[PDB]
Amino acid sequence: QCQDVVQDVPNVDVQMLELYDRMSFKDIDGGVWKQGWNIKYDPLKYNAHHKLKVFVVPHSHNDPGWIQTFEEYYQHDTKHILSNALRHLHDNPEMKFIWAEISYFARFYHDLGENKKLQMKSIVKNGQLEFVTGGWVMPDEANSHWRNVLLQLTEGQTWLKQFMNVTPTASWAIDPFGHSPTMPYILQKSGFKNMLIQRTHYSVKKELAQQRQLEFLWRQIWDNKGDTALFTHMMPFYSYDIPHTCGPDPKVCCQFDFKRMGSFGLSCPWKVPPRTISDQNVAARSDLLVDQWKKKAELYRTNVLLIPLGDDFRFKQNTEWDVQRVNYERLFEHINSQAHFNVQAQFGTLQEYFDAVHQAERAGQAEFPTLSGDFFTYADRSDNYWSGYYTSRPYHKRMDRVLMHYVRAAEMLSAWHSWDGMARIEERLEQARRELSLFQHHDGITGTAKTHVVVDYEQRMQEALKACQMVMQQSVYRLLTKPSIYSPDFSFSYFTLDDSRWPGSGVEDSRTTIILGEDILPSKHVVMHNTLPHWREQLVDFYVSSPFVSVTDLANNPVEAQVSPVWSWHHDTLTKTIHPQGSTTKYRIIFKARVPPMGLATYVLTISDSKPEHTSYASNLLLRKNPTSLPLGQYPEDVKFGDPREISLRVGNGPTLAFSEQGLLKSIQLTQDSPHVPVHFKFLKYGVRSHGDRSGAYLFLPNGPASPVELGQPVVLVTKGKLESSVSVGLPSVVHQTIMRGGAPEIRNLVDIGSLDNTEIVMRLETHIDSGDIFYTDLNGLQFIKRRRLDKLPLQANYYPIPSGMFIEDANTRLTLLTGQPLGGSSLASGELEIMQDRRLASDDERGLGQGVLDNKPVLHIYRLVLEKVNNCVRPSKLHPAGYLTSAAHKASQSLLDPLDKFIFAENEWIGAQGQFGGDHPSAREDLDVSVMRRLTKSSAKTQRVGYVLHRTNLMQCGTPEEHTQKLDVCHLLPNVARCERTTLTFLQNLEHLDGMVAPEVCPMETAAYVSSHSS
Ligand SMILES: O=C(Nc1ccc(Cl)cc1)O/N=C1\N[C@H](CO)[C@@H](O)[C@H](O)[C@H]1O
């Protein structure tokens, strides 16, 4: 019933991995079309009964932050563009305009009076102003998580449906730096019919153009049937600006950008300015322009041609609207009335273009090719590959993933109840969704904005995290307090969030110590939340004021715990070492929390005067020449010292890890019977070219392969505990930590590139896996795609986005690295994986930013490292373009991206406390997630509505027998269900009324949305 996503290789006309394997990437001068060739056309192709239909589509690219902040641009540019659009379109009925960025449109619309709102609605209604995509932003496609792509699309489309009563079905993505099939995946499931893309490698544009394969049905890589296909138009030329949109010769096209005549400070760099169209030159100018259009049309299969007309922050001035509109109207009048051109040209919208193309297709003009794959890594010219922004500003890349989780958790926790308006829950959740959605912009998460703009995004995300914390903690208080005892005040802090990994140890001393004492306060409630729809156990840790602490559950059952010191690291400028210091005033308590599906569990920490029965203490070993003592206050075990040596550790039944004398992993033995498999961590640095093109925020232009970071004799700290052990080493620019809790290790890097200008720090893994030239990287946390290292491409082209994970494998062994933040990475030799940590660039890379990247700050990167035997796994065949995680790797990814949330009760006594919430929630199969749970109605609605997005991944079968699991029917998670509907993923259209009000679970690799309606 479900499609098999593993075992059937789809047959498509263009499969991008295969196309890459065959294609030439030579950068040859193609003439006026520098990256193409001199286009020829048969003049007789067009005649009285077969005319070329041209749609000139005015647009204005508005970045929600880049060289100015969102609000700076809105005040300086965008408010003027939209005010002038409203005026000019209202006054000129044949003029059209498309608008993409709903963040700005909403910012504008809410400063409009009623009269202007009605005027605006009128030009939308009549089709003059058309929204394209309708997302809050035009998102990055490399670093963004699919959940956030959906978040921002939903934010924008919900706004448009509520205020404009429109839902776009055509998407416009002219600026993201390379393109992902995650986009058509999400769009096709959200009602879209067509999409347009632009920034693809110039060699791919040439290859596809030659074959008229620039318009294609883009299906997912595993889709044998084609049910996921979305019609896609790829623009053929170097840019979306007017010189690169009218046709192949920018010297000619520039003459048709009427903003470039002088009075607007713009000109044509090809040295021929535009001239005003008049009766004395209209025929000559028309001839020039039609010949460009006819050349562009040769690259496409129908007689319908798309001519975008715009550029960045265009259509700002009244006089600009006039100069473009009047000159084009003069051209259209001449061209259309002169039969010898056989052209009918008009202003159009994007949807108008696609409608006409499909009309032509239905008329049998053309059949379109099918395509799968992705469009990374982009290069716009020569060897200038845009793999730098897979890593740029990694602090904020990590912050994105943190906020992604806290928005999900806040929406889910608060969804269980309806809230009085005074609680301000909807206000806070809307703020958080909008700040996270804004950051998905292709100059946000990409790390390609100016320094002060990055600070604006950071501040906005900090406010969003605060809003999430507020909603979460109010929700926990409500869900775990006896209903007749619950006495909320909506401005009060019942709990504080405790997060061990953001900002992280050594980044910020943000964490609250639980203060207990025999003479003051014996015990403290803590609460864990599990956003995933299965029972979950995870070790959690808290800081406490004494090492003599016992843990119990809320039936007072003892829970095994481990206490460890609180270690921090310091670049000790006196002794010239990077070395740890232990706290003498607080300690870490660690225990396994077990939490219901989408639920909560309460535990209690209690002080004692001596070592508790069920709490053990870690040993600590400091390996270094020239040791000095490390006192630890009340901690009962003295630190031990040793000269650097190889060491091995094993927690529980789990793998045994060996470490070099520099405290870096060297090997992993999976079981007592198995071999010690070589897996070596190494840190290296890339530099920058002294002559020739410089790396910057966008571009990665290394001066050769990376060189090893010289480690000296680093200080190594070993902590050995029953529940958790770790090895940490202070290296130059990186405190590197491997943590073992009895399965796949966790890796944490506290990365501080300091003042190392023109350096990029990379973490590499070296193994004996014979992967050859193959490796796998994920796309938007949604799917893994097969990559092939090509030596016909330079090193920076073989870097790909690693938004959530990467792996290499051979017949028997796989090594998967899961990430808690998007970064760039590759496999540059058989058996290697590498992932960039940070980059500090003192030069601009000539893409408009006008600065390097010199605002680095310490960031705590997190990973899981999974080594597995895979000879028993049922994998795709050699020619299949996808890869799939194992269950262990998928759970490891979930542990990074959606960990348990931890709450500390903020006062001395919690009256009416309960031990659990969600004990009765079904525990769904491990491949299924409830990606979104969101209440859609305010508390006054008679009919309450809750939306759910359900995602089922596909995990490899490797012989672990499948346990029975419960069916999850989201429509029955809340009481009094009156209806259950399947909807588009934005919740905006009902697709199916569901029998028995039961929401079916979805197939592997499918995502479905459901809305349950409840009588209230
Ligand atoms: O690169 C530019 N530079 C530029 C922009 C406006 C003006 Cl008036 C003059 C120059 O244009 N636009 C853009 N440039 C960047 C890529 O090169 C990209 O990060 C940004 O999002 C994209 O919109």
Ligand SMILES: [Zn+2]
């Ligand atoms: Zn842009």
